[PDB]
């Protein structure tokens, strides 16, 4: 009964033309340890920001899900930093993920919008 | 970043002379999915079978959700285990075993060598 599944969150700051954006790529089944590894970089990225200025891209194309603890870490990060994001582009596949993006958008102050194409997402995002 | 750590639980019935025990090996950082893969096997074993052996030499720990599944399993089934040999290394794992022993109705004892453990286990 063993398993060696690939998972994690990649975080970076990317560029599209003359705009910088915060990029995430969530892969596999996320754990609390994954949120822990990513949190200091996120805190570094948002240092000094107290207004809705940030735009982010979150690629969930290879995301399987979140552990229970990870789901709580995620909500904690949203409660703590979410107001600082004005727009969030979600990149995934299918209508069920589109629907989940619309549900997230209802809950959040920043504008969340779903895409399948990165170039479309970046055009809207920045 | 990315990772692909090995984790899981091996379970099965084993022999020591003309005598049997339930063997567990806990590897890595255990998750809820690991507990769900393992539970139906544990139940079939208990319907068919008590003393057990738990190898923690390669155990890192349990996720929050898994610690809960684990406690749920101990509350349901631990009374059925009269003796539990914990196979591990070091005094921190021994201490953890002694703490577990205090909490539980069966006798839990720490060993470094499987052969020494099986002599006491059955
Ligand atoms: Cl977790
Ligand atoms: Cl879990
Ligand atoms: Na929103
Ligand atoms: Na005990």
Residue numbers in the entry:
A (entry chain A): 0 to 125
B (entry chain B): 0 to 48, 53 to 125
Which text from the study accompanies this structure?
The crystal structures of the proteins encoded by the YP_749275.1 and YP_001095227.1 genes from Shewanella frigidimarina and S. loihica, respectively, have been determined at 1.8 and 2.25 Å resolution, respectively. These proteins are members of a novel family of bacterial proteins that adopt the α/β SpoIIAA-like fold found in STAS and CRAL-TRIO domains.
An ortholog with 54% sequence identity from S. loihica (YP_001095227.1) is also of unknown function, with a molecular weight of 14 105 Da (residues 1–125) and a calculated isoelectric point of 4.9. Similarly, the structure of YP_001095227.1 consists of a protein dimer (residues 0–125 for chain A and residues 0–48 and 53–125 for chain B), two sodium ions, two chloride ions, nine 2-methyl-2,4-pentanediol molecules and 95 water molecules in the asymmetric unit. In the ‘open’ conformation (YP_001095227.1), these helices are 15 Å apart, leading to the creation of a deep nonpolar cavity. An analysis using the CastP server reveals a deep cavity (1743 Å3) lined by over 20 residues that are all hydrophobic, except for Asp73, which is hydrogen bonded to Tyr34. The floor of the cavity is formed by the β-sheet and helix α1. This large hydrophobic cavity represents a potential ligand-binding pocket that is occupied in the crystal structure by three 2-methyl-2,4-pentanediol (MPD) molecules, which are likely to stabilize the ‘open’ conformation by partially filling the cavity. Conversely, in the ‘open’ state, Trp71 is solvent-exposed and may participate in protein–membrane interactions, whereas His6 and His31 form stabilizing hydrogen bonds with Asp33 and Asp72, respectively. The dimerization mode of the ‘open’ structure, YP_001095227.1, is different and comparatively weaker. The presence of a deep cavity in YP_001095227.1 is similar to the eukaryotic Sec14-like proteins, which also adopt the same SpoIIAA-like fold. Calculations using the PPM method show that the ‘open’ conformation of YP_001095227.1 can associate with the lipid bilayer by immersing its exposed nonpolar residues from α2 and α3 into the lipid acyl-chain region.
